């Protein structure tokens, strides 16, 4: 049993900033890589970063730098991601994903939701 | 056809030690004995020794310029004849040669050992010292 | 870096799909499919196997750098958004629709 | 024609994961890495150069790097097990700063605090650096593993010093090691030597730079699972060292209360001279260079047009964004910012100054609900160090850019030790063999092929002796079933097979290595042992022997 | 059983046809979770909804 339980759904202007949550459960939370995924309508699906908890290292992807930051609570187990300036581009539905083993990260079994974020 | 493939040896400091195999199938190893020479590559052949044959005595009888430095061994569950080589000099080099010696005898003009002789040899194995 | 079959792609119940992802880069490579609002699944995982859950209808791999994934007799819960993954990268995205 | 022979030490090893025991030198028996129970070392190891032989290594999955994290972990846990608690130290703490007297990191934290009887209370004021101190909600605050975990003290006279631990093999196991000087953790090593411990192995703790520890011998190398993915960290390893002074400039005076029946306190007293800032040196041109030579290794994996951009790390907590190491008992936490700012195109005494925070509630191998107490050392600290290695992460994600990103990261524990344990592979010996002969009733040489073989030839360490014992009794058992109770060579009755892989017996002496005339059986093996059971002597000792 | 005629001695009956029993608690219990020391924490029924 793995779940990825995602919230948010947040209507959002431009030029303010979101944030949304993903809660794990069933898996240990620390000792496996997290992944944050956009899916926008006709638009090619970017990987915007990962994280990895025990020590909570990040990996932003190069055309969001600067603006995306991923954070977690441990003890909660839930990561949050953050964007600090929105756009008319980032209309899409956001996913908190998982690899299918991390000891390789890229096979995306487990997906959250999804959290659609309109702009 | 007796293949005989001898495949050791190598580059080696004037002192050192090395280990030589002969191979050989297609016959029976098991009586038929065994000897090795040696050719140095600026010169021709040379006698290096020869086990004998099981229950002929079992034994090996070196040479001249090898008594003390050589010695031969057989396996013949494996059909193996090695020779193992210490104690080296420079003059020791060449492609070792193993063939299978033979008994010959006869009347008339017989006298012991008499005579024996190389029918079927290996291809060679070049062993050279620095 | 990653490229795809025509995104318009339609087919009736029934036949084989063929969707061809070419890749530039070496890794292994996975294939997504997406229902009408629900998030994305793992169908093809390392090239050519499938993910647990997942009928034998989907298969299908090539040794070099042109991927063909085939469905063959599709069902009415088929006919998705498909995405194949090489790495981070994930290329157009090809609908499968009636 | 051809008969099964049983030989016994053929030199046939197999991969293999087991328990391996620790090997100090000498030892003040206050070392937090001594279990003093490690026995003592091997003043000339037996390192047995093999024969030509290529051996498949990876450093990416062995399993010594797994079972010495565990070890790490239950060693450092078992060190602060009999210390001070800490429980009634999570106290409301009213905290004013640390001022010039005339115009924020340290806080003076007054605070209440038991004694050593219950029903009285003392009032003792201290100093506690900002990162460990949380506000609450009129300036009270509090220690910063308070409302989760539970903060242990380190015992005073436990020395937090790396010392050299070699990890020994049991008997019946080997260590392999790859001398290939060029060898990049994973694939074949055509010069593989045997041992049975490995070298010291210092458990030096740092997070983006690999400190001492040992350098590569001709060149940077540099070692990834796959270098294009993005989610494996890079390891550097460097060929010469960049020395890393640091100190800790305050003239800190501790002082001690008692808390409890046999328990004190260790905290900062106070601090006679200025304040200052902790700091590390790292020397500029030598640091510009060693980045010159990891451009020109990184340049191999990647295009040859490629610019290399070096920046600091992204994100991630206090031990990840930033190099944390000890330094004479104190816990440095450096900005590195300093080191990793560049952009390198594809074609004096002067020293980088790193600001360095220092730490006292520390969790090293980040665990829920766990954290200690560091007590602050007396006096000024100082360290020289060398750094051998680095911990790369790269950013990627775009197709265009043409530049690669390569900042710092911490990563896990365990990348510091797959730079200690990359030579070596845990083999386990099986030393039987089977092979077909004319005749009807150490590791040294692998590389040989047969026949030239043939004749050429604490409770940690108790599961460890055990399992040989049981092993050696096993091989044992097999000579026993077998009709061959004497050593090395016995012939026996079964016939060969012809199916059983059949080369005519002159190829297989000579051309072929006891490993592979074992990969050429192995899956038949069980078949030999089943014909070679006793149900050949049965007919061989139970019909033919009642007289 | 032991000697089967001793008191003061278990009988075991064992079933060939199992019967099936079925258990429940129907208060909808909203728990709530309170911190009573350094990590450990205390949990307790919050209220019946
Ligand atoms: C990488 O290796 C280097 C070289 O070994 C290492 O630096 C060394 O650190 C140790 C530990 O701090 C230093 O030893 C100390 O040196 C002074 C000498 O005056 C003393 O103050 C210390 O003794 C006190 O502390 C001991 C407890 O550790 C007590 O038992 C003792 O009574 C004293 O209170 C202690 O001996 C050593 O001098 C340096 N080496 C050099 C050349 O400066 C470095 O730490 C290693 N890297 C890492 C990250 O640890
Ligand atoms: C990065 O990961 C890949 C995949 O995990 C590693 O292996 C590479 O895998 C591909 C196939 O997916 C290999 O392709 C091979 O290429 C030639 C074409 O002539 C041929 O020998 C084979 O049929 C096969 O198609 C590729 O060679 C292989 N890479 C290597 C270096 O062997 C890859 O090694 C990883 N990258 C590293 C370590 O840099
Ligand atoms: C400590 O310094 C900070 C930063 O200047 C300031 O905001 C704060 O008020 C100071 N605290 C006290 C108690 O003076
Ligand atoms: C902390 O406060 C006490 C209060 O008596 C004072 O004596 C001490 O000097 C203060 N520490 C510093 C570093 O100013
Ligand atoms: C310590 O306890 C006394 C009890 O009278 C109280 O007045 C005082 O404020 C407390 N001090 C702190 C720093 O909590
Ligand atoms: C309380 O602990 C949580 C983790 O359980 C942490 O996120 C939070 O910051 C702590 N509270 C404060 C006031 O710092
Ligand atoms: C380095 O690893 C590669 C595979 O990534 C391997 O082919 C190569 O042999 C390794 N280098 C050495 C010197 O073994
Ligand atoms: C470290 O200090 C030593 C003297 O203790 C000095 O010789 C050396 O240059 C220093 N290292 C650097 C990088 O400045
Ligand atoms: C480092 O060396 C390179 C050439 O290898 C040079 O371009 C660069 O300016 C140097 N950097 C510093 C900080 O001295
Ligand atoms: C290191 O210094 C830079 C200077 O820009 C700063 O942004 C960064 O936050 C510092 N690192 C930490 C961990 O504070
Ligand atoms: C700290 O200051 C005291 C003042 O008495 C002095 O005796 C001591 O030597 C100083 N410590 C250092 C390490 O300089
Ligand atoms: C740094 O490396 C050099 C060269 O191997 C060595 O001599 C020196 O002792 C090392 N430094 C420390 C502090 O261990
Ligand atoms: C079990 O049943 C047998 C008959 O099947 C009977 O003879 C025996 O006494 C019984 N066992 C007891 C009473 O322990």
């Known amino acids: 049993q793995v779940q990825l339980v995602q919230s948010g759904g947040q209507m959002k202007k431009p030029g303010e900033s979101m944030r949304i949550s993903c809660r794990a459960s069933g898996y240990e939370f620390i000792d496996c890589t997290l992944n944050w995924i956009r899916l926008a309508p006709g638009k090619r699906p970017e990987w915007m970063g990962w994280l990895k908890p025990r020590g909570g290292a990040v990996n932003y992807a190069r055309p969001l730098q600067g603006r995306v930051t991923m954070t977690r609570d441990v003890y909660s187990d839930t990561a949050f991601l953050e964007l600090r300036s929105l756009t008319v581009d980032d209309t899409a539905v956001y996913f908190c994903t998982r690899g299918k083993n991390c000891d390789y990260n890229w096979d995306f079994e487990h997906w959250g939701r999804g959290t659609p974020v309109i702009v | 056809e007796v293949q005989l493939v001898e495949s050791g040896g190598g580059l080696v400091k004037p002192g050192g030690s090395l280990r030589l195999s002969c191979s050989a199938s297609?016959?029976?190893?098991?009586?038929?004995?065994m000897t090795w020479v040696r050719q140095p590559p600026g010169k021709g052949l040379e006698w290096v020794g020869r086990?004998?044959?099981?229950?002929?005595?079992?034994?090996?009888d070196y040479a001249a310029p090898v008594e003390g430095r050589f010695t031969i061994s057989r396996l013949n569950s494996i059909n193996f004849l090695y020779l193992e080589m210490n104690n080296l000099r420079m003059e020791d080099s060449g492609l070792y040669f193993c063939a299978r010696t033979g008994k010959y005898y006869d009347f008339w003009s017989g006298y012991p050992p008499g005579e024996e002789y190389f029918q079927d040899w290996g291809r060679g194995t070049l062993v050279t010292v620095s | 870096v990653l490229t795809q079959s025509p995104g318009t792609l339609s087919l009736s119940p029934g036949e084989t799909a063929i969707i061809s992802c070419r890749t530039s880069q070496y890794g292994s490579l996975a294939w997504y499919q997406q229902r009408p609002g629900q998030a994305p699944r793992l169908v093809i995982y390392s090239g050519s196997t499938r993910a647990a859950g997942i009928p034998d209808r989907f298969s299908g791999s090539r040794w070099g750098p042109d991927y063909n994934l085939t469905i063959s007799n599709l069902e009415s819960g088929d006919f998705g958004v498909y995405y194949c993954q090489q790495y981070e990268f994930f290329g157009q995205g090809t609908k499968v629709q009636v | 024609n051809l008969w099964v022979t049983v030989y016994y030490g053929v030199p046939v090893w197999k991969d293999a994961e087991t328990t391996l025991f620790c090997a100090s030198d000498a030892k003040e028996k206050h070392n937090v890495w001594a279990t003093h129970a490690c026995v003592p070392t091997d003043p000339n190891p037996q390192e047995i150069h093999l024969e030509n032989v290529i051996e498949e290594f990876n450093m990416w999955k062995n399993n010594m790097v797994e079972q010495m994290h565990e070890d790490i972990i239950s060693l450092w846990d078992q060190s602060l097990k009999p210390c001070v608690k800490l429980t009634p130290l999570c106290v409301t703490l009213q905290c004013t700063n640390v001022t010039n007297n005339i115009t924020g990191e340290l806080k003076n934290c007054s605070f209440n605090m038991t004694t050593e009887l219950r029903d009285k209370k003392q009032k003792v004021y201290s100093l506690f650096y900002r990162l460990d101190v949380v506000q609450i909600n009129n300036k009270e605050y509090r220690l910063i593993n308070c409302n989760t975990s539970a903060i242990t003290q380190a015992c005073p006279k436990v020395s937090f010093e790396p010392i050299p631990i070699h990890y020994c093999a049991p008997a019946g196991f080997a260590i392999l090691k790859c001398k290939d000087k060029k060898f990049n953790g994973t694939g074949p090593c055509p010069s593989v030597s045997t041992v049975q411990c490995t070298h010291g192995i210092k458990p030096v703790v740092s997070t983006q730079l690999l400190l001492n520890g040992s350098l590569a011998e001709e060149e940077v190398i540099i070692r990834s699972e796959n270098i294009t993915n993005n989610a494996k960290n890079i390891l550097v390893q460097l060929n010469t060292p960049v020395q890393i002074n640091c100190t800790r400039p305050n003239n800190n005076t501790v002082k001690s209360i008692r808390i409890g029946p046999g328990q004190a306190f260790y905290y900062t007293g106070d601090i006679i001279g200025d304040i200052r800032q902790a700091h590390c040196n790292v020397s500029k041109a030598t640091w510009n260079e060693t980045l010159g030579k990891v451009v020109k290794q990184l340049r191999k994996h990647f295009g040859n047009n490629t610019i290399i951009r070096f920046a600091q790390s992204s994100g991630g907590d206090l031990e990840v964004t930033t190099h944390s190491f000890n330094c004479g008992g104190e816990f440095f936490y450096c900005n590195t910012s300093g080191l990793f700012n560049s952009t390198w195109i594809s074609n004096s005494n002067d020293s980088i100054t790193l600001p360095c925070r220092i730490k006292q509630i520390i969790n090293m191998w980040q665990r829920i609900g766990q954290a200690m107490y560091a007590p602050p050392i007396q006096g000024v600290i100082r360290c020289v160090s060398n750094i051998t290695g680095l911990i790369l992460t790269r950013d990627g994600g775009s197709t265009n850019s043409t530049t690669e990103t390569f900042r710092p990261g911490g990563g896990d524990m365990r990348d510091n030790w797959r730079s200690e344990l990359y030579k070596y592979k845990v083999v386990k010996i099986e030393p039987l063999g089977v092979a077909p002969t004319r005749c009807k009733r150490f590791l040294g040489a692998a590389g040989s092929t047969m026949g030239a073989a043939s004749m050429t030839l604490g409770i940690k360490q108790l599961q460890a002796r055990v399992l040989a014992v049981e092993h050696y009794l096993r091989d044992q058992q097999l000579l026993g079933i077998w009709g061959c109770s004497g050593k090395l060579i016995c012939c026996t009755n079964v016939p060969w097979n012809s199916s059983w892989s059949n080369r005519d017996l002159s190829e297989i002496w000579d051309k072929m290595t006891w490993l592979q005339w074992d990969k050429e059986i192995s899956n038949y093996t069980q078949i030999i042992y089943g014909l070679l059971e006793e149900s050949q002597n049965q007919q061989e000792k139970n019909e033919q022997d009642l007289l | 059983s032991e000697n089967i005629t001793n008191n003061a001695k278990n009988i075991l009956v064992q079933l060939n046809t199992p019967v099936q029993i079925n258990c429940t608690r129907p208060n909808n219990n909203t728990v709530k979770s309170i911190r009573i020391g350094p990590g450990q924490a205390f949990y307790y029924t919050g209220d019946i909804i």
């Open positions: 297609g016959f029976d190893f098991d009586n038929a004995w």
């Open positions: 086990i004998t044959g099981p229950g002929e005595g079992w034994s090996v």
